Structure formats: C-alpha cells, structure tokens
Design a protein around this nucleic acid. Structure first.
Ligand SMILES: [Zn+2]
Ligand SMILES: [Zn+2]
Length: 100
DNA sequence: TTGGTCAGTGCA
DNA sequence: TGCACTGACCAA
C-alpha cells in the first residue's frame, strides 16, 4: 500500500496522480472530472453546479461557510449516468471498474 | 482569487 | 478495505 503514480489516460493529459489503496477512488474521479464539460456536481444548499468535487469543496468554503459538505462520495455521485461513465473510463478505467 | 494537486485517516 | 471527508502548498 505504498504511493505510486497512476497515469491519466485522457487524450494528451500528462498528469499522474499519486495513489494508494487507502485513498479509494474519489481523487481519481475528481481528476477525471477536470476533463468533463458537463456539470455533474450539484450543490445541496443552493442551485449551483460545477465540474469537479474539488470545485464543490471551494464552493462550500466560500458560499456556505457554516455548512458541512455532505454526500459527495462515490455513493452520492451519478455513477450510473452513461456520460459520467464515459469520462471515468477515458481516464482511469482500470481503477474505476468496481465503482458501481 | 480559484482550485488542481499532495498528504492524510477514523471508522464502517 | 476503502469510503468520504480533513488541511494545505502553490500554479494559474
Ligand atoms: Zn487527466
Ligand atoms: Zn451552493
């Protein structure tokens, strides 16, 4: 369970993500969403939507300073959506197989 | 300012 | 096991 870099397989993406098993899937999903033009992340306190989990972290920090960010793991994401799955499998298909 | 990254981990 | 959340460095 030592940190190893996982190369993103999105076309022309040169980013690798440092990864180990305790981390789980979320930071890989989060990087895959950088390549996504849909807005699958929906705020639970207002109508705002955005592309990545990280952007939603920044949204709660700035716009909902007294709220706890909740339900933004795998279990709370639209993992059965076909467009979502396409982006995931374009980036980290090997690591995001058992996502559902 | 925005937020992509690393690093981290208690508990089911 | 790995989920789903924490704090923080630093590029743009
Ligand atoms: Zn990538
Ligand atoms: Zn909001």
């Amino acid at each position: 369970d030592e940190i190893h870099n996982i190369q993103c397989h999105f076309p022309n993406c040169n980013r690798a993500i440092a990864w180990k098993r305790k981390y789980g899937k979320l930071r890989l999903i989060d990087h895959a969403l950088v390549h996504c033009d849909k807005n699958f992340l929906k705020c639970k306190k207002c109508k705002h939507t955005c592309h990545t989990i990280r952007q939603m972290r920044y949204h709660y920090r700035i716009f909902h300073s007294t709220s706890k960010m909740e339900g933004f793991g795998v279990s709370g994401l639209p993992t059965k959506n076909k467009g979502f799955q396409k982006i995931m499998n374009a980036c980290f298909a090997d690591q995001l197989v058992e996502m559902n």
